[PDB]
Design a protein around this ligand. Structure first.
Ligand SMILES: O=C(CSc1nc2cc([N+](=O)[O-])ccc2[nH]1)Nc1ccc(Oc2ccccc2)cc1
Ligand SMILES: O=C(CSc1nc2cc([N+](=O)[O-])ccc2[nH]1)Nc1ccc(Oc2ccccc2)cc1
Lengths: 202, 203
């Protein structure tokens, strides 16, 4: 029945709040995980047959796909505590651009405005695990979800760099892209309503 | 010390007045200038403009001697005349909106950022929000405008909201503070940031 793509920037709790609400309406449900850099390329494939996509990546007029804001989540710009960016005030994007960025690569090679690397010096990886291993080791800087960097910010294994830019983290819209068939279904609007209502309350 | 500050017209009055309040507390001698969001960045990048700070919803990333940060958040609404085809039906995507005339803010430069560029291909450019809503009131198209510009007309039934299904409570929008490289070292500016941010969160 319902193929649902979830993106790895969506928090585990955010998934289970999405998971549960679907259980109340649908019986059969497939959950699929991708990088945020591959999420919108995945749904665009016809042969993938994906009904819903919950991701942070953004686009305007998509073929056969509606769009809505499901809620918000936080990302943090991070680096090793002894990395030169820490021992320094960080007022611009062009200050970060002097140093190397560890970004997610896509299978296509291109990125959206939101996910395109902001640096001249760039090193691509395929998941946030790989990204943070490099960053922990002192190689570059990266932007990653709160849940991926939470434990290490308490440990002092990483430092936050984005805190004068946007205190509390970099607020990020979580979109829901959905197949146009799902416009009508009362079960889907219920899903939307109860997903949102609960995602606010986290 | 002395400051010339730009604030765009998408920033609501209580947000403007809060920012005014803190600046006058931390600096002596402040000046204000108001512009369309679509002309805010092009204004501060002029030679003889001498604007030290710009508080605006428009985005650029790089391309300037100005530092960037996020001062706060603000809500916009997609609106239309209560009749008009878009109301007598549901509305899930850009495709539906792109079948009708957008009344967009136009820039004097000619260009637009990714944020402010019109989504439809049937488009009609105005120079401010007053003019946008005059055409929207009259039934000519749809537009996106701040809450405080449409608050009174929405409760009258003069306008209707087309964007509650897409983003309940309004389309959330970051308010950026662009600032002079000279200000980055000054304690008064950092105090200003801390105080304004906390007061803005309290609104
Ligand atoms: O790096 C990028 C492009 S890749 C990207 N990956 C993301 C992951 C997520 N997520 O996991 O939720 C969200 C957004 C992402 N964007 N943008 C970028 C945004 C803000 C910054 O903050 C600054 C800090 C100091 C001074 C100036 C700016 C720096 C860079
Ligand atoms: O039209 C634009 C670009 S121009 C623009 N002017 C702005 C003013 C403000 N402000 O005053 O605060 C803020 C953002 C602006 N962006 N974006 C756009 C955003 C969301 C929409 O919502 C939908 C509604 C129904 C179904 C699908 C989507 C539609 C269009």
């Amino acid at each position: 029945n319902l193929r649902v793509l979830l993106d790895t920037a969506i928090p585990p709790s955010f998934c289970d709040t999405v998971s549960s609400v679907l259980l109340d309406d649908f019986n059969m449900v497939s959950l699929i995980r991708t990088s945020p850099a591959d999420s919108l390329a995945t749904i665009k494939q016809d042969n993938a047959e994906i009904d819903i996509a919950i991701t942070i990546d953004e686009e305007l007029k998509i073929s056969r796909f509606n769009q809505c804001v499901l809620g918000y989540t936080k990302a943090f710009v991070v680096a090793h505590p002894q990395h030169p960016l820490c021992n320094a005030s960080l007022h611009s994007i062009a200050s970060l651009a002097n140093y190397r960025q560890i970004s997610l690569g896509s299978r296509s090679g291109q990125h959206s405005n939101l996910l395109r690397p902001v640096s001249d010096k760039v090193l691509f990886v395929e998941n946030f695990d790989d990204m943070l291993r490099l960053v922990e080791a002192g190689v570059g800087w990266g932007i990653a979800p709160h849940y991926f960097v939470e434990e290490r910010l308490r440990n002092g294994t990483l430092a936050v760099l984005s805190e004068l830019y946007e205190p509390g983290g970099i607020d990020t819209k979580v979109y829901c892209y959905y197949n146009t068939a799902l416009e009508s279904e009362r079960s889907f609007l219920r899903f939307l309503e109860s997903a949102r209502q609960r995602l606010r309350e986290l």
